[PDB]
Amino acid sequence: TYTLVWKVWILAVTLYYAIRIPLTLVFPSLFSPLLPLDILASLALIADIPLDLAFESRRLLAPSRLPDLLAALPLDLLVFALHLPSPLSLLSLVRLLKLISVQRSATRILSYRINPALLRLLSLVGFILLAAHGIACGWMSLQPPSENPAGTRYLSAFYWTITTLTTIGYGDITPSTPTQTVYTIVIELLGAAMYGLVIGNIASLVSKLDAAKLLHRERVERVTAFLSYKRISPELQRRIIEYFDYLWETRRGYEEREVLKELPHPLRLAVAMEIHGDVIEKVPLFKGAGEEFIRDIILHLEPVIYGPGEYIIRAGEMGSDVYFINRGSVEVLSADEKTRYAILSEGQFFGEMALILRAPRTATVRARAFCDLYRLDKETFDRILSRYPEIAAQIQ
Amino acid sequence: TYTLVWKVWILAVTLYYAIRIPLTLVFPSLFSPLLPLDILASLALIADIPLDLAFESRRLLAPSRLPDLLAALPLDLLVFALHLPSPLSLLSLVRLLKLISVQRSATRILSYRINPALLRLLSLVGFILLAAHGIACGWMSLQPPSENPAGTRYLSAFYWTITTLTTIGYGDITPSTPTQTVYTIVIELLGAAMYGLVIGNIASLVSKLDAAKLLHRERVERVTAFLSYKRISPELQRRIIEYFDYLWETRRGYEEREVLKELPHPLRLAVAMEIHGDVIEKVPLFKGAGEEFIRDIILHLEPVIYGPGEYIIRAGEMGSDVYFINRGSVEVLSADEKTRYAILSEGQFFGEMALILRAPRTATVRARAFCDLYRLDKETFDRILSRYPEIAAQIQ
Amino acid sequence: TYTLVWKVWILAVTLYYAIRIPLTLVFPSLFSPLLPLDILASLALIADIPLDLAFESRRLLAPSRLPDLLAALPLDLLVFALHLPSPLSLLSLVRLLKLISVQRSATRILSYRINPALLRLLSLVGFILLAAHGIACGWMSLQPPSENPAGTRYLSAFYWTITTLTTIGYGDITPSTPTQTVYTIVIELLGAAMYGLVIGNIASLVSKLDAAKLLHRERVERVTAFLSYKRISPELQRRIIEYFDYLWETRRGYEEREVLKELPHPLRLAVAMEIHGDVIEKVPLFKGAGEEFIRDIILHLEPVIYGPGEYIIRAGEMGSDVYFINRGSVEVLSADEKTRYAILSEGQFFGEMALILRAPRTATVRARAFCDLYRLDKETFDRILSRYPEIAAQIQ
Amino acid sequence: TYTLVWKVWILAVTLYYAIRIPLTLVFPSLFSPLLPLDILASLALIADIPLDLAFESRRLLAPSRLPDLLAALPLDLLVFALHLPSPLSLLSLVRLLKLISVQRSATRILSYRINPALLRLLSLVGFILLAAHGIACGWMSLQPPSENPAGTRYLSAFYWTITTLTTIGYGDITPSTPTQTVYTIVIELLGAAMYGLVIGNIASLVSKLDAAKLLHRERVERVTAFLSYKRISPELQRRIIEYFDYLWETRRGYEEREVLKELPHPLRLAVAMEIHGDVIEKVPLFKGAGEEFIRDIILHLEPVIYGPGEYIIRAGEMGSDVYFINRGSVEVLSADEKTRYAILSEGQFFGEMALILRAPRTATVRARAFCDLYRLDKETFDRILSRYPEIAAQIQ
Numbered sequence A, B, C, D: 001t002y003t004l005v006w007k008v009w010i011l012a013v014t015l016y017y018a019i020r021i022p023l024t025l026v027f028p029s030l031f032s033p034l035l036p037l038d039i040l041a042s043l044a045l046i047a048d049i050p051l052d053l054a055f056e057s058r059r060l061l062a063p064s065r066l067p068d069l070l071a072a073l074p075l076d077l078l079v080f081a082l083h084l085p086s087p088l089s090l091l092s093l094v095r096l097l098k099l100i101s102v103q104r105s106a107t108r109i110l111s112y113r114i115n116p117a118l119l120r121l122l123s124l125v126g127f128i129l130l131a132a133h134g135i136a137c138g139w140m141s142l143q144p145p146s147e148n149p150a151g152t153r154y155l156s157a158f159y160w161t162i163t164t165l166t167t168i169g170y171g172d173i174t175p176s177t178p179t180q181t182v183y184t185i186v187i188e189l190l191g192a193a194m195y196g197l198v199i200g201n202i203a204s205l206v207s208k209l210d211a212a213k214l215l216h217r218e219r220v221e222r223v224t225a226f227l228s229y230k231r232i233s234p235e236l237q238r239r240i241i242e243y244f245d246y247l248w249e250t251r252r253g254y255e256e257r258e259v260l261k262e263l264p265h266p267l268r269l270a271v272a273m274e275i276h277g278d279v280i281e282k283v284p285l286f287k288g289a290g291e292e293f294i295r296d297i298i299l300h301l302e303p304v305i306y307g308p309g310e311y312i313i314r315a316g317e318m319g320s321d322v323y324f325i326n327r328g329s330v331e332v333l334s335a336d337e338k339t340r341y342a343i344l345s346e347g348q349f350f351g352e353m354a355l356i357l358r359a360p361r362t363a364t365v366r367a368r369a370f371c372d373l374y375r376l377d378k379e380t381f382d383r384i385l386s387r388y389p390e391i392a393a394q395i396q
């Protein structure tokens, strides 16, 4: 927590040089009442690399280290103190190689807090404005010298380098000399490239913007276009469509057994233990068993979703499996579907007299709303029951 | 159904303010014979938030609620009644924060009726025109004052703010003062950003436009480029290609067992019951069985597709499985493939003397057109037959 | 084959109207020595709809039929014969609704011959040029009338409507009147929209251009970045990389068992019969078996790929499975890897004394180049051998 | 290694013609003191096609060969020696068809060293600059003839053809004649097309730029948005999130059993042998077994990842499986979780008294950091142990 303020300070220092250096190459009337900030920022840039090594790499010559090395040394201040000429002063731009280090720091200190496409887009907008400043300083540099206030002759140059980079091109102020025209051609290429990069990053940002909502929309029309071929009845097709509308608006389209298959075994055990915690210590058949038994029955529960009105259990069937209610409600009717016995709710269960006995179903269990209930098969229970002899004697 | 007309009314009210307010900031000669519409619309905006709470959230200070709160209060009408000056009148634009609420309402009331990329594109076109109006009003505001009809001095400003935002840039009318030039730079940035967003949304809209037809086109060339490596004969390769052309033009490329695996168990049971309804109550071996038997044989049927001329059953083979015709036709030939016994059609079946007996095939069953027929294996039938003793005695 | 020439004729007729009608709205000095082509093309458009019904739909009021219906009737020729004025002549553009029918015909008569993105891009380029003609005619229409040759006053208008639609915007010739300026604003919107559609279709065309070569490139770096974490030796890692280079440059990256799983059972049987045809009728253990036996052993062969130098069979091992060579070569060495017994090639086999006997390996079988050989497990052979009693007696 | 220098020489020769030929069509005052380079380069182009056949195709009339054939012959030098006129000289551009051969050579000699989208983008930038030269030569050609230095009248033409292709369009220098205007329209179309191709390739380049980091970011929010529906506790949810942060920052998001399933059987055996090499020759139960035994136990090990504090083995449980530590550390506690017995590290193992015996767990094994350990089930060990009788007698 005390290296992040140092990274913010280094970002401020390099942003300071990025605004100041091409502005003082044009005007040498600056730098003279402003040298102490150069002193402070140069000491900061030369002292960052020991703190770049220690407390940053443990917790000096590399192909991914030398921009910071070339940015560290005071290659500037010699130019502005000794009045080096125009084709030789330009090496004071070597401090601008520091921005690669700040890019590479910012693309990992907050890379998973925010979207990687959005971070790249914001970094590109920052570099484009910060480069439009330098291009405006260059255009202001190679103008014919005339008496003009230093605000207005910068304002026209910045207006020109925004008109050229965004490819609008009013053409109200144009090149005159050939040495202006070569500079104009090369920044037309750079402006078209930057605007292509911006359109590419926005196209990569809004393409993946709705993927969960588009994948579900494709999966819901694949089933519909298939069942229209099979000449299905429209009522059942409407029931399937309202099932998918439920499954989108509750758990966002994702199937249960394919989400918690991407967890390892102890975390999947922990999630299933947290889910079926207030349910499994209620049945009067698993009481008195060990903790070894509950962890093995709790990993073989299978989720199903019954719509409103679906017959879970018909009276008079064979019947094999027990059902644990998790979210919805359900009702229990008689064999003639008239006399309501009772109503069940979440945290309860039904069908427990099927794991131990070969009796046929004794009632009709109809769903009321969407249920989201789990089930346990008789074969799976007796398969993982064969290795526990004490409960194998308990159920007999 | 009576809240949707209220949402349409609120959209009309906020669109009314979005057109009117920057137009009356430039011309104070309006608002005076037009105050009653302000009264009606302000009452509507201040009375929407009780109906935003009740009958909308049940069926007041939140980070996703405060734009509607700041849009609700009559922060306007005080400016236009008391003649507040130019840098202070601009807070009458706070009503324009209402558009966030209308965006968030419209992106969920009709989000699955239409395409989410198309909805975002239409909303962006709406916001771009509705913002081009305000930018034209701003450009018309900071002009040098001269006698000019109020239609033409708006028409040139709207022509300018469309020439700048779409990045054409004729340059026939340009900035003159510095305070115009700063405004021109900032809306050049906004225009390049909006046009990047439009190109990005169109690129995300037409990329996923043919996905079902492109996925099948990739799957049909992956098989062809693989079988060209194996040095396959061109006749069988042409038969595979016409198989995939059939499977595209009938059920749109999708495989049967991977479409109805994305349904839950009761809906998959209901779909299979609707498909094999007029077929399974015709065989003279499953008649007299229970409803528990039919629901378990109907879930283990496996679809296959035979091309025109494919040998389904050769006379003299071992033979294990029964076949149920669903869509196409098929013919039955003798052992020498000469004397046609009969012809079968949809709704019928063949091979029923293989589930119960160890006799060899008694004829040759050749397909005629594309068949789309289901089959049932003998091992699967006898596996799910072992738990039903009465039909296990019936077949003996 | 004789309806395609009629579709080409209808495309020529509607392209004729699309070039001619806005050009003759500006110049009424045409149409008079050119009426017979109108007669022929109008008869063609009114006679296409019986051939649109018969021999096209079997092999009259619908929401996808009425553009052809409105294009069929001679709503034109009345305007140009009776000299209808300017705001009323424009309904002669209703013939231009025929292009929807030609679009919908061309997007299905050759939809799978070529790429669906490329077809949409070419159709959009056609519509953009064909609309730039009409927009040029409109700009030429609402000019101030002056004596000027009819080639040059069209050439400047077409130059303007290409400068505006491609968003270059030289600005050398501009609007003058307000009624020109409104037309300029609306086609600036249309030009920005069309150029957004072109960039979107090119971005959707070149994104999926290399998918087979990019998917393999991702799969080859996922394995490398994983095995670099496990601290693997660089020699084996180089051998894995040259394996993937082989598997790209021969069968284009695709795995064998996931390509021919997307075929149905009879076509998969036919492909496996064509592959293992000149191989399986060579072993002296399957000779004398039936055709029922070969079709069941041929569906359980499993492909493996051995690199140059990989030990297939080590002398002295347990050994269970037989190997069928398909593409590469292999060599057979002794127990001390010195005395070469023989060399094998494609179409041959080795390890046949493992299906019938519990003897240990008798030699060392080293690969020489990449082999691409199939294998058959002993358990699978004896599992599908248990149901054939005669070969079960033959092998004993 | 000595054909790559020849390909570089041919690329240099065709780049030489691509710069020189349209520049000498405008100025016939060249070519005369510069013919010997034409002689050398023409001999190179006519002698490349024998080395294109031999040592390139083995290691003459084809639809993918004839551009090189038409580029080979000296169709030039006759024009510049005999002073052919303007509409007939243009066939000297046929040498420019050589660039297709260089494109097709470069798109395969270094196609998997670098990114296929990046290669296409760099090739398009090369072709766009190399075509902007020729378009500038054409614009310079059809100018009104006036005395002007040959550097400046080229510099304005290149400035114009960069202003038009990047769609900026200052409009400072414009067409004058109609024959200039037709050329301007056709290169406006070409410039809009090229800039659409550049934006499309950048949009296809930066879309797939972070796929491994975006796929993991989607998989980590799918689990979180699902477990928020199940009303899970925030502490376990934080533990799941830090698990996924570990699994990203170590092995880049990929699951173990789905990476080395995309290898064939001998390479998967070799990778597992390299991983479990310094581990399996340490247990005092597998010592004295054969090499046939180790290769079969080493293919059935299953990876699991325990977080810091997860109970691997609880004292008093049933217990079945043995665990092999690979990367992390683990600690062994007593039944009351107080007295630390020992600490284990990588290369070691625990739980070996579970494969042979039906005793219950004798301690508590808690993880300390992230472990990355493999396990072997008792049922799998005894299943692959049943076919080896000597170790089946050794364990008793």
Ligand SMILES: Nc1nc2c(ncn2[C@@H]2O[C@@H]3COP(=O)(O)O[C@H]3[C@H]2O)c(=O)[nH]1
Binding pocket: A313, A319, A332, A341, A342, A350, A351, A352, A353, A354, A360, A361, A362, A363, A364, A365
């Ligand atoms: N008969 C009966 N069963 C009930 C009642 N309430 C819940 N159930 C459950 O409904 C189940 C349906 O018959 P089961 O044999 O599956 O076991 C039954 C009970 O577990 C009730 O009031 N009467």
Ligand SMILES: Nc1nc2c(ncn2[C@@H]2O[C@@H]3COP(=O)(O)O[C@H]3[C@H]2O)c(=O)[nH]1
Binding pocket: D313, D319, D332, D341, D342, D350, D351, D352, D353, D354, D360, D361, D362, D363, D364, D365
């Ligand atoms: N009891 C005991 N077990 C240990 C010790 N160090 C490692 N272990 C392993 O811890 C395992 C836990 O009990 P096991 O029966 O699985 O087998 C035990 C040993 O293999 C130790 O000091 N004491």
